[PDB]
Amino acid sequence: QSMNINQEQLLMFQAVMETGSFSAAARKLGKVPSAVSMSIANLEIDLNLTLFEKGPTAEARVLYEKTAQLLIEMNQWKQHAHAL
Amino acid sequence: SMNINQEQLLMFQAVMETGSFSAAARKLGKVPSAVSMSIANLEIDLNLTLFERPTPTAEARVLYEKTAQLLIEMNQWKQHAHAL
């Protein structure tokens, strides 16, 4: 299930973390809020982790820290792959 | 390059390392035609031919090298996720 997580989900997680809402994160990434919501929901299912609390940001969603290092490598991977 | 998934990369590495779609499928507990289609999807995403008939291209061998580096980080992230 954690196998299923794609780059797009992590990019949307990082934007919500940063901008504080699904609405702001959609604004930042040029996506629509439906997309961010659906993606985060799928990410929470894949990880089996609740990432955001209307009470909103999990204890466990400090996973944004570790996602930052992986996002570096994902973008570096893309560049090597495009230059083949 | 696209925002493509981890499963696809794990599948690519197993074909590189076992030399066949079915051995890769066997190793990962996946269906062989699922492995083949995932690899085909990656070839379209990268606009690269990765295998011939399955023998890697020169581009695939270099891609294996870049992918092993990203795989180090994907593993750390998943361990951190499974730990929460």
PDB file of all heavy atoms in Angstrom, chain A residues 7-48:
ATOM      1  N   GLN A   7       4.570  10.190  -6.883  1.00  0.00           N
ATOM      2  CA  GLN A   7       5.164  11.497  -6.617  1.00  0.00           C
ATOM      3  C   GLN A   7       4.101  12.568  -6.432  1.00  0.00           C
ATOM      4  O   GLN A   7       4.230  13.435  -5.560  1.00  0.00           O
ATOM      5  CB  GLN A   7       6.114  11.899  -7.737  1.00  0.00           C
ATOM      6  CG  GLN A   7       6.718  13.278  -7.505  1.00  0.00           C
ATOM      7  CD  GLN A   7       7.908  13.529  -8.385  1.00  0.00           C
ATOM      8  OE1 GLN A   7       8.271  12.675  -9.190  1.00  0.00           O
ATOM      9  NE2 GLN A   7       8.527  14.696  -8.243  1.00  0.00           N
ATOM     10  N   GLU A   8       3.058  12.539  -7.262  1.00  0.00           N
ATOM     11  CA  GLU A   8       2.048  13.591  -7.232  1.00  0.00           C
ATOM     12  C   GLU A   8       1.409  13.722  -5.850  1.00  0.00           C
ATOM     13  O   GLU A   8       1.178  14.839  -5.372  1.00  0.00           O
ATOM     14  CB  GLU A   8       0.999  13.302  -8.301  1.00  0.00           C
ATOM     15  CG  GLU A   8       0.013  14.406  -8.554  1.00  0.00           C
ATOM     16  CD  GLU A   8      -1.097  13.945  -9.469  1.00  0.00           C
ATOM     17  OE1 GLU A   8      -0.893  13.959 -10.702  1.00  0.00           O
ATOM     18  OE2 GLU A   8      -2.158  13.541  -8.953  1.00  0.00           O
ATOM     19  N   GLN A   9       1.126  12.589  -5.189  1.00  0.00           N
ATOM     20  CA  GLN A   9       0.561  12.630  -3.841  1.00  0.00           C
ATOM     21  C   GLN A   9       1.490  13.350  -2.876  1.00  0.00           C
ATOM     22  O   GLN A   9       1.041  14.145  -2.047  1.00  0.00           O
ATOM     23  CB  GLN A   9       0.301  11.216  -3.327  1.00  0.00           C
ATOM     24  CG  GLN A   9      -0.932  10.552  -3.871  1.00  0.00           C
ATOM     25  CD  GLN A   9      -0.899   9.049  -3.668  1.00  0.00           C
ATOM     26  OE1 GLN A   9      -0.157   8.345  -4.345  1.00  0.00           O
ATOM     27  NE2 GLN A   9      -1.676   8.556  -2.706  1.00  0.00           N
ATOM     28  N   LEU A  10       2.790  13.071  -2.958  1.00  0.00           N
ATOM     29  CA  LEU A  10       3.735  13.703  -2.045  1.00  0.00           C
ATOM     30  C   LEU A  10       3.863  15.195  -2.329  1.00  0.00           C
ATOM     31  O   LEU A  10       4.002  16.003  -1.403  1.00  0.00           O
ATOM     32  CB  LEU A  10       5.089  13.003  -2.148  1.00  0.00           C
ATOM     33  CG  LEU A  10       5.093  11.535  -1.691  1.00  0.00           C
ATOM     34  CD1 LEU A  10       6.520  11.036  -1.509  1.00  0.00           C
ATOM     35  CD2 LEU A  10       4.307  11.353  -0.404  1.00  0.00           C
ATOM     36  N   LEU A  11       3.804  15.583  -3.604  1.00  0.00           N
ATOM     37  CA  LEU A  11       3.874  16.999  -3.947  1.00  0.00           C
ATOM     38  C   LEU A  11       2.665  17.751  -3.410  1.00  0.00           C
ATOM     39  O   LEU A  11       2.760  18.923  -3.025  1.00  0.00           O
ATOM     40  CB  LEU A  11       3.973  17.154  -5.464  1.00  0.00           C
ATOM     41  CG  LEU A  11       5.350  16.870  -6.052  1.00  0.00           C
ATOM     42  CD1 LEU A  11       5.289  16.873  -7.561  1.00  0.00           C
ATOM     43  CD2 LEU A  11       6.327  17.925  -5.551  1.00  0.00           C
ATOM     44  N   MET A  12       1.518  17.083  -3.375  1.00  0.00           N
ATOM     45  CA  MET A  12       0.306  17.713  -2.878  1.00  0.00           C
ATOM     46  C   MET A  12       0.293  17.749  -1.353  1.00  0.00           C
ATOM     47  O   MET A  12      -0.173  18.724  -0.755  1.00  0.00           O
ATOM     48  CB  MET A  12      -0.886  16.958  -3.443  1.00  0.00           C
ATOM     49  CG  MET A  12      -1.346  17.560  -4.736  1.00  0.00           C
ATOM     50  SD  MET A  12      -2.689  16.649  -5.426  1.00  0.00           S
ATOM     51  CE  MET A  12      -2.784  17.385  -7.046  1.00  0.00           C
ATOM     52  N   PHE A  13       0.805  16.693  -0.715  1.00  0.00           N
ATOM     53  CA  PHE A  13       1.004  16.704   0.731  1.00  0.00           C
ATOM     54  C   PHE A  13       1.915  17.856   1.156  1.00  0.00           C
ATOM     55  O   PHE A  13       1.628  18.565   2.129  1.00  0.00           O
ATOM     56  CB  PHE A  13       1.575  15.351   1.169  1.00  0.00           C
ATOM     57  CG  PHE A  13       1.934  15.280   2.628  1.00  0.00           C
ATOM     58  CD1 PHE A  13       1.017  15.643   3.603  1.00  0.00           C
ATOM     59  CD2 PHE A  13       3.190  14.855   3.023  1.00  0.00           C
ATOM     60  CE1 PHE A  13       1.357  15.593   4.952  1.00  0.00           C
ATOM     61  CE2 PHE A  13       3.532  14.792   4.369  1.00  0.00           C
ATOM     62  CZ  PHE A  13       2.607  15.164   5.335  1.00  0.00           C
ATOM     63  N   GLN A  14       3.024  18.055   0.434  1.00  0.00           N
ATOM     64  CA  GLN A  14       3.967  19.112   0.798  1.00  0.00           C
ATOM     65  C   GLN A  14       3.329  20.492   0.671  1.00  0.00           C
ATOM     66  O   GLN A  14       3.561  21.368   1.512  1.00  0.00           O
ATOM     67  CB  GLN A  14       5.225  18.994  -0.065  1.00  0.00           C
ATOM     68  CG  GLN A  14       5.857  20.315  -0.490  1.00  0.00           C
ATOM     69  CD  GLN A  14       7.140  20.112  -1.289  1.00  0.00           C
ATOM     70  OE1 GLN A  14       7.109  20.012  -2.518  1.00  0.00           O
ATOM     71  NE2 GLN A  14       8.277  20.064  -0.592  1.00  0.00           N
ATOM     72  N   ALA A  15       2.488  20.693  -0.349  1.00  0.00           N
ATOM     73  CA  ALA A  15       1.850  21.992  -0.541  1.00  0.00           C
ATOM     74  C   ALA A  15       0.801  22.277   0.535  1.00  0.00           C
ATOM     75  O   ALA A  15       0.682  23.417   1.000  1.00  0.00           O
ATOM     76  CB  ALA A  15       1.230  22.066  -1.937  1.00  0.00           C
ATOM     77  N   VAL A  16       0.009  21.275   0.930  1.00  0.00           N
ATOM     78  CA  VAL A  16      -0.976  21.508   1.991  1.00  0.00           C
ATOM     79  C   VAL A  16      -0.270  21.856   3.302  1.00  0.00           C
ATOM     80  O   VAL A  16      -0.576  22.870   3.941  1.00  0.00           O
ATOM     81  CB  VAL A  16      -1.912  20.295   2.154  1.00  0.00           C
ATOM     82  CG1 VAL A  16      -2.808  20.495   3.357  1.00  0.00           C
ATOM     83  CG2 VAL A  16      -2.779  20.104   0.901  1.00  0.00           C
ATOM     84  N   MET A  17       0.679  21.015   3.721  1.00  0.00           N
ATOM     85  CA  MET A  17       1.604  21.293   4.815  1.00  0.00           C
ATOM     86  C   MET A  17       2.109  22.731   4.817  1.00  0.00           C
ATOM     87  O   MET A  17       2.157  23.378   5.870  1.00  0.00           O
ATOM     88  CB  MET A  17       2.796  20.341   4.726  1.00  0.00           C
ATOM     89  CG  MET A  17       2.558  18.936   5.253  1.00  0.00           C
ATOM     90  SD  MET A  17       1.474  18.941   6.694  1.00  0.00           S
ATOM     91  CE  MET A  17       2.693  18.729   7.993  1.00  0.00           C
ATOM     92  N   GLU A  18       2.488  23.240   3.644  1.00  0.00           N
ATOM     93  CA  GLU A  18       3.117  24.553   3.570  1.00  0.00           C
ATOM     94  C   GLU A  18       2.090  25.677   3.640  1.00  0.00           C
ATOM     95  O   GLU A  18       2.245  26.624   4.419  1.00  0.00           O
ATOM     96  CB  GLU A  18       3.941  24.659   2.289  1.00  0.00           C
ATOM     97  CG  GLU A  18       5.355  24.152   2.432  1.00  0.00           C
ATOM     98  CD  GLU A  18       6.010  23.898   1.094  1.00  0.00           C
ATOM     99  OE1 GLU A  18       5.462  24.366   0.077  1.00  0.00           O
ATOM    100  OE2 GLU A  18       7.066  23.228   1.055  1.00  0.00           O
ATOM    101  N   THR A  19       1.032  25.588   2.841  1.00  0.00           N
ATOM    102  CA  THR A  19       0.106  26.697   2.686  1.00  0.00           C
ATOM    103  C   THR A  19      -1.060  26.664   3.670  1.00  0.00           C
ATOM    104  O   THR A  19      -1.784  27.658   3.772  1.00  0.00           O
ATOM    105  CB  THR A  19      -0.414  26.724   1.249  1.00  0.00           C
ATOM    106  OG1 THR A  19      -1.319  25.629   1.042  1.00  0.00           O
ATOM    107  CG2 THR A  19       0.742  26.610   0.273  1.00  0.00           C
ATOM    108  N   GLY A  20      -1.272  25.556   4.382  1.00  0.00           N
ATOM    109  CA  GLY A  20      -2.238  25.509   5.465  1.00  0.00           C
ATOM    110  C   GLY A  20      -3.661  25.121   5.108  1.00  0.00           C
ATOM    111  O   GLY A  20      -4.505  25.048   6.010  1.00  0.00           O
ATOM    112  N   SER A  21      -3.970  24.873   3.838  1.00  0.00           N
ATOM    113  CA  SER A  21      -5.314  24.458   3.465  1.00  0.00           C
ATOM    114  C   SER A  21      -5.250  23.700   2.148  1.00  0.00           C
ATOM    115  O   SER A  21      -4.265  23.797   1.410  1.00  0.00           O
ATOM    116  CB  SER A  21      -6.256  25.660   3.342  1.00  0.00           C
ATOM    117  OG  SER A  21      -5.923  26.446   2.208  1.00  0.00           O
ATOM    118  N   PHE A  22      -6.312  22.924   1.865  1.00  0.00           N
ATOM    119  CA  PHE A  22      -6.447  22.333   0.533  1.00  0.00           C
ATOM    120  C   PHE A  22      -6.652  23.405  -0.524  1.00  0.00           C
ATOM    121  O   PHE A  22      -6.199  23.251  -1.666  1.00  0.00           O
ATOM    122  CB  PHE A  22      -7.617  21.343   0.457  1.00  0.00           C
ATOM    123  CG  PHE A  22      -7.533  20.192   1.421  1.00  0.00           C
ATOM    124  CD1 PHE A  22      -8.682  19.682   2.002  1.00  0.00           C
ATOM    125  CD2 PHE A  22      -6.318  19.619   1.741  1.00  0.00           C
ATOM    126  CE1 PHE A  22      -8.622  18.620   2.884  1.00  0.00           C
ATOM    127  CE2 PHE A  22      -6.245  18.559   2.629  1.00  0.00           C
ATOM    128  CZ  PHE A  22      -7.401  18.057   3.199  1.00  0.00           C
ATOM    129  N   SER A  23      -7.343  24.485  -0.161  1.00  0.00           N
ATOM    130  CA  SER A  23      -7.628  25.556  -1.109  1.00  0.00           C
ATOM    131  C   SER A  23      -6.352  26.286  -1.510  1.00  0.00           C
ATOM    132  O   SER A  23      -6.081  26.473  -2.701  1.00  0.00           O
ATOM    133  CB  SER A  23      -8.639  26.519  -0.492  1.00  0.00           C
ATOM    134  OG  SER A  23      -9.442  25.835   0.459  1.00  0.00           O
ATOM    135  N   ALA A  24      -5.552  26.697  -0.524  1.00  0.00           N
ATOM    136  CA  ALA A  24      -4.300  27.377  -0.829  1.00  0.00           C
ATOM    137  C   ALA A  24      -3.349  26.468  -1.595  1.00  0.00           C
ATOM    138  O   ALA A  24      -2.671  26.911  -2.530  1.00  0.00           O
ATOM    139  CB  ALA A  24      -3.650  27.873   0.459  1.00  0.00           C
ATOM    140  N   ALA A  25      -3.288  25.188  -1.215  1.00  0.00           N
ATOM    141  CA  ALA A  25      -2.374  24.266  -1.883  1.00  0.00           C
ATOM    142  C   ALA A  25      -2.764  24.057  -3.343  1.00  0.00           C
ATOM    143  O   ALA A  25      -1.896  24.005  -4.221  1.00  0.00           O
ATOM    144  CB  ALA A  25      -2.331  22.942  -1.134  1.00  0.00           C
ATOM    145  N   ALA A  26      -4.063  23.934  -3.622  1.00  0.00           N
ATOM    146  CA  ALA A  26      -4.517  23.894  -5.008  1.00  0.00           C
ATOM    147  C   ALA A  26      -4.054  25.135  -5.765  1.00  0.00           C
ATOM    148  O   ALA A  26      -3.551  25.042  -6.889  1.00  0.00           O
ATOM    149  CB  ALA A  26      -6.041  23.764  -5.056  1.00  0.00           C
ATOM    150  N   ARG A  27      -4.207  26.309  -5.144  1.00  0.00           N
ATOM    151  CA  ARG A  27      -3.760  27.557  -5.758  1.00  0.00           C
ATOM    152  C   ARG A  27      -2.280  27.495  -6.115  1.00  0.00           C
ATOM    153  O   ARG A  27      -1.876  27.891  -7.215  1.00  0.00           O
ATOM    154  CB  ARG A  27      -4.029  28.728  -4.809  1.00  0.00           C
ATOM    155  CG  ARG A  27      -5.447  29.288  -4.851  1.00  0.00           C
ATOM    156  CD  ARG A  27      -5.587  30.518  -3.939  1.00  0.00           C
ATOM    157  NE  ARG A  27      -6.549  30.298  -2.865  1.00  0.00           N
ATOM    158  CZ  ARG A  27      -6.274  30.426  -1.572  1.00  0.00           C
ATOM    159  NH1 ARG A  27      -5.077  30.806  -1.156  1.00  0.00           N
ATOM    160  NH2 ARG A  27      -7.225  30.167  -0.675  1.00  0.00           N
ATOM    161  N   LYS A  28      -1.457  26.984  -5.196  1.00  0.00           N
ATOM    162  CA  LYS A  28      -0.014  26.969  -5.405  1.00  0.00           C
ATOM    163  C   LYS A  28       0.392  26.033  -6.538  1.00  0.00           C
ATOM    164  O   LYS A  28       1.292  26.357  -7.324  1.00  0.00           O
ATOM    165  CB  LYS A  28       0.695  26.569  -4.110  1.00  0.00           C
ATOM    166  CG  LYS A  28       2.197  26.390  -4.257  1.00  0.00           C
ATOM    167  CD  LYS A  28       2.942  27.694  -4.077  1.00  0.00           C
ATOM    168  CE  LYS A  28       4.360  27.438  -3.601  1.00  0.00           C
ATOM    169  NZ  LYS A  28       4.419  27.320  -2.118  1.00  0.00           N
ATOM    170  N   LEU A  29      -0.238  24.860  -6.633  1.00  0.00           N
ATOM    171  CA  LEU A  29       0.178  23.858  -7.608  1.00  0.00           C
ATOM    172  C   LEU A  29      -0.552  23.951  -8.939  1.00  0.00           C
ATOM    173  O   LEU A  29      -0.283  23.137  -9.828  1.00  0.00           O
ATOM    174  CB  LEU A  29      -0.006  22.441  -7.052  1.00  0.00           C
ATOM    175  CG  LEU A  29       0.371  22.131  -5.611  1.00  0.00           C
ATOM    176  CD1 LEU A  29      -0.469  20.962  -5.118  1.00  0.00           C
ATOM    177  CD2 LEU A  29       1.851  21.801  -5.541  1.00  0.00           C
ATOM    178  N   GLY A  30      -1.463  24.902  -9.108  1.00  0.00           N
ATOM    179  CA  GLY A  30      -2.198  24.958 -10.354  1.00  0.00           C
ATOM    180  C   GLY A  30      -3.156  23.806 -10.534  1.00  0.00           C
ATOM    181  O   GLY A  30      -3.446  23.420 -11.671  1.00  0.00           O
ATOM    182  N   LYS A  31      -3.644  23.236  -9.440  1.00  0.00           N
ATOM    183  CA  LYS A  31      -4.619  22.153  -9.442  1.00  0.00           C
ATOM    184  C   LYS A  31      -5.908  22.671  -8.815  1.00  0.00           C
ATOM    185  O   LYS A  31      -5.982  23.813  -8.353  1.00  0.00           O
ATOM    186  CB  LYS A  31      -4.082  20.950  -8.668  1.00  0.00           C
ATOM    187  CG  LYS A  31      -2.602  20.637  -8.913  1.00  0.00           C
ATOM    188  CD  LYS A  31      -2.330  19.463  -9.859  1.00  0.00           C
ATOM    189  CE  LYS A  31      -2.962  19.596 -11.224  1.00  0.00           C
ATOM    190  NZ  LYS A  31      -2.320  18.626 -12.166  1.00  0.00           N
ATOM    191  N   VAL A  32      -6.930  21.823  -8.777  1.00  0.00           N
ATOM    192  CA  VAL A  32      -8.201  22.215  -8.174  1.00  0.00           C
ATOM    193  C   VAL A  32      -8.339  21.533  -6.817  1.00  0.00           C
ATOM    194  O   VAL A  32      -7.712  20.491  -6.584  1.00  0.00           O
ATOM    195  CB  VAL A  32      -9.382  21.894  -9.103  1.00  0.00           C
ATOM    196  CG1 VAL A  32      -9.263  22.720 -10.371  1.00  0.00           C
ATOM    197  CG2 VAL A  32      -9.442  20.393  -9.415  1.00  0.00           C
ATOM    198  N   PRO A  33      -9.118  22.095  -5.888  1.00  0.00           N
ATOM    199  CA  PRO A  33      -9.177  21.508  -4.535  1.00  0.00           C
ATOM    200  C   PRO A  33      -9.653  20.067  -4.513  1.00  0.00           C
ATOM    201  O   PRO A  33      -9.189  19.281  -3.674  1.00  0.00           O
ATOM    202  CB  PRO A  33     -10.153  22.439  -3.803  1.00  0.00           C
ATOM    203  CG  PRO A  33      -9.998  23.754  -4.502  1.00  0.00           C
ATOM    204  CD  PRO A  33      -9.797  23.399  -5.955  1.00  0.00           C
ATOM    205  N   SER A  34     -10.582  19.704  -5.403  1.00  0.00           N
ATOM    206  CA  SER A  34     -11.010  18.312  -5.516  1.00  0.00           C
ATOM    207  C   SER A  34      -9.824  17.387  -5.705  1.00  0.00           C
ATOM    208  O   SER A  34      -9.770  16.296  -5.125  1.00  0.00           O
ATOM    209  CB  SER A  34     -11.974  18.159  -6.689  1.00  0.00           C
ATOM    210  OG  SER A  34     -13.250  18.641  -6.349  1.00  0.00           O
ATOM    211  N   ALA A  35      -8.858  17.808  -6.517  1.00  0.00           N
ATOM    212  CA  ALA A  35      -7.703  16.961  -6.766  1.00  0.00           C
ATOM    213  C   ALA A  35      -6.867  16.797  -5.507  1.00  0.00           C
ATOM    214  O   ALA A  35      -6.396  15.694  -5.208  1.00  0.00           O
ATOM    215  CB  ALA A  35      -6.866  17.540  -7.908  1.00  0.00           C
ATOM    216  N   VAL A  36      -6.672  17.878  -4.752  1.00  0.00           N
ATOM    217  CA  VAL A  36      -5.816  17.812  -3.570  1.00  0.00           C
ATOM    218  C   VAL A  36      -6.462  16.945  -2.494  1.00  0.00           C
ATOM    219  O   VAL A  36      -5.820  16.053  -1.921  1.00  0.00           O
ATOM    220  CB  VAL A  36      -5.521  19.232  -3.062  1.00  0.00           C
ATOM    221  CG1 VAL A  36      -4.912  19.190  -1.672  1.00  0.00           C
ATOM    222  CG2 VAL A  36      -4.605  19.940  -4.043  1.00  0.00           C
ATOM    223  N   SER A  37      -7.739  17.203  -2.208  1.00  0.00           N
ATOM    224  CA  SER A  37      -8.536  16.381  -1.304  1.00  0.00           C
ATOM    225  C   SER A  37      -8.453  14.907  -1.668  1.00  0.00           C
ATOM    226  O   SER A  37      -8.083  14.064  -0.844  1.00  0.00           O
ATOM    227  CB  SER A  37      -9.994  16.845  -1.343  1.00  0.00           C
ATOM    228  OG  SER A  37     -10.812  16.027  -0.523  1.00  0.00           O
ATOM    229  N   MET A  38      -8.797  14.579  -2.913  1.00  0.00           N
ATOM    230  CA  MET A  38      -8.804  13.179  -3.315  1.00  0.00           C
ATOM    231  C   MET A  38      -7.416  12.571  -3.109  1.00  0.00           C
ATOM    232  O   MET A  38      -7.277  11.459  -2.584  1.00  0.00           O
ATOM    233  CB  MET A  38      -9.225  13.072  -4.784  1.00  0.00           C
ATOM    234  CG  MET A  38      -9.499  11.671  -5.294  1.00  0.00           C
ATOM    235  SD  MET A  38     -10.930  10.976  -4.420  1.00  0.00           S
ATOM    236  CE  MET A  38     -12.242  11.754  -5.355  1.00  0.00           C
ATOM    237  N   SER A  39      -6.375  13.315  -3.480  1.00  0.00           N
ATOM    238  CA  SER A  39      -5.008  12.812  -3.389  1.00  0.00           C
ATOM    239  C   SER A  39      -4.596  12.567  -1.941  1.00  0.00           C
ATOM    240  O   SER A  39      -4.033  11.513  -1.612  1.00  0.00           O
ATOM    241  CB  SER A  39      -4.061  13.809  -4.056  1.00  0.00           C
ATOM    242  OG  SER A  39      -2.767  13.271  -4.228  1.00  0.00           O
ATOM    243  N   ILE A  40      -4.852  13.540  -1.062  1.00  0.00           N
ATOM    244  CA  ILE A  40      -4.526  13.381   0.357  1.00  0.00           C
ATOM    245  C   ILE A  40      -5.282  12.199   0.955  1.00  0.00           C
ATOM    246  O   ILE A  40      -4.730  11.423   1.750  1.00  0.00           O
ATOM    247  CB  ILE A  40      -4.833  14.683   1.124  1.00  0.00           C
ATOM    248  CG1 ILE A  40      -3.972  15.848   0.618  1.00  0.00           C
ATOM    249  CG2 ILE A  40      -4.656  14.480   2.621  1.00  0.00           C
ATOM    250  CD1 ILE A  40      -2.508  15.524   0.524  1.00  0.00           C
ATOM    251  N   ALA A  41      -6.568  12.070   0.619  1.00  0.00           N
ATOM    252  CA  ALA A  41      -7.357  10.951   1.116  1.00  0.00           C
ATOM    253  C   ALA A  41      -6.731   9.627   0.700  1.00  0.00           C
ATOM    254  O   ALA A  41      -6.588   8.703   1.515  1.00  0.00           O
ATOM    255  CB  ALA A  41      -8.790  11.054   0.600  1.00  0.00           C
ATOM    256  N   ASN A  42      -6.338   9.525  -0.574  1.00  0.00           N
ATOM    257  CA  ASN A  42      -5.684   8.311  -1.049  1.00  0.00           C
ATOM    258  C   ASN A  42      -4.343   8.091  -0.348  1.00  0.00           C
ATOM    259  O   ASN A  42      -3.991   6.956  -0.007  1.00  0.00           O
ATOM    260  CB  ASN A  42      -5.511   8.394  -2.568  1.00  0.00           C
ATOM    261  CG  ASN A  42      -6.820   8.208  -3.302  1.00  0.00           C
ATOM    262  OD1 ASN A  42      -7.697   7.496  -2.831  1.00  0.00           O
ATOM    263  ND2 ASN A  42      -6.964   8.854  -4.453  1.00  0.00           N
ATOM    264  N   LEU A  43      -3.587   9.165  -0.111  1.00  0.00           N
ATOM    265  CA  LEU A  43      -2.314   9.040   0.596  1.00  0.00           C
ATOM    266  C   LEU A  43      -2.519   8.511   2.014  1.00  0.00           C
ATOM    267  O   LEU A  43      -1.785   7.622   2.470  1.00  0.00           O
ATOM    268  CB  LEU A  43      -1.602  10.392   0.621  1.00  0.00           C
ATOM    269  CG  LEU A  43      -0.320  10.502   1.438  1.00  0.00           C
ATOM    270  CD1 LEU A  43       0.724   9.507   0.919  1.00  0.00           C
ATOM    271  CD2 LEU A  43       0.203  11.932   1.382  1.00  0.00           C
ATOM    272  N   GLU A  44      -3.511   9.061   2.729  1.00  0.00           N
ATOM    273  CA  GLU A  44      -3.832   8.583   4.073  1.00  0.00           C
ATOM    274  C   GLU A  44      -4.229   7.114   4.048  1.00  0.00           C
ATOM    275  O   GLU A  44      -3.844   6.345   4.937  1.00  0.00           O
ATOM    276  CB  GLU A  44      -4.958   9.426   4.681  1.00  0.00           C
ATOM    277  CG  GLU A  44      -4.581  10.888   4.953  1.00  0.00           C
ATOM    278  CD  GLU A  44      -5.670  11.660   5.695  1.00  0.00           C
ATOM    279  OE1 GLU A  44      -6.854  11.500   5.351  1.00  0.00           O
ATOM    280  OE2 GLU A  44      -5.348  12.442   6.618  1.00  0.00           O
ATOM    281  N   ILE A  45      -4.997   6.703   3.036  1.00  0.00           N
ATOM    282  CA  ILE A  45      -5.352   5.292   2.903  1.00  0.00           C
ATOM    283  C   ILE A  45      -4.104   4.454   2.646  1.00  0.00           C
ATOM    284  O   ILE A  45      -3.883   3.431   3.303  1.00  0.00           O
ATOM    285  CB  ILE A  45      -6.410   5.101   1.801  1.00  0.00           C
ATOM    286  CG1 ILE A  45      -7.707   5.792   2.201  1.00  0.00           C
ATOM    287  CG2 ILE A  45      -6.702   3.626   1.588  1.00  0.00           C
ATOM    288  CD1 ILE A  45      -8.689   5.996   1.066  1.00  0.00           C
ATOM    289  N   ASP A  46      -3.258   4.883   1.702  1.00  0.00           N
ATOM    290  CA  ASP A  46      -2.058   4.117   1.362  1.00  0.00           C
ATOM    291  C   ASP A  46      -1.166   3.913   2.582  1.00  0.00           C
ATOM    292  O   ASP A  46      -0.685   2.802   2.833  1.00  0.00           O
ATOM    293  CB  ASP A  46      -1.254   4.824   0.262  1.00  0.00           C
ATOM    294  CG  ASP A  46      -1.905   4.756  -1.111  1.00  0.00           C
ATOM    295  OD1 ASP A  46      -2.745   3.857  -1.372  1.00  0.00           O
ATOM    296  OD2 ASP A  46      -1.545   5.621  -1.945  1.00  0.00           O
ATOM    297  N   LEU A  47      -0.878   4.996   3.308  1.00  0.00           N
ATOM    298  CA  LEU A  47      -0.053   4.982   4.515  1.00  0.00           C
ATOM    299  C   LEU A  47      -0.765   4.410   5.730  1.00  0.00           C
ATOM    300  O   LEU A  47      -0.089   4.078   6.711  1.00  0.00           O
ATOM    301  CB  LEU A  47       0.407   6.400   4.860  1.00  0.00           C
ATOM    302  CG  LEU A  47       1.206   7.226   3.868  1.00  0.00           C
ATOM    303  CD1 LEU A  47       1.617   8.531   4.478  1.00  0.00           C
ATOM    304  CD2 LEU A  47       2.452   6.429   3.653  1.00  0.00           C
ATOM    305  N   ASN A  48      -2.092   4.302   5.693  1.00  0.00           N
ATOM    306  CA  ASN A  48      -2.890   4.019   6.882  1.00  0.00           C
ATOM    307  C   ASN A  48      -2.486   4.945   8.027  1.00  0.00           C
ATOM    308  O   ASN A  48      -2.156   4.511   9.135  1.00  0.00           O
ATOM    309  CB  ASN A  48      -2.779   2.553   7.293  1.00  0.00           C
ATOM    310  CG  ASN A  48      -3.941   2.111   8.149  1.00  0.00           C
ATOM    311  OD1 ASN A  48      -5.094   2.466   7.878  1.00  0.00           O
ATOM    312  ND2 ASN A  48      -3.652   1.333   9.190  1.00  0.00           N
TER     313      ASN A  48
END
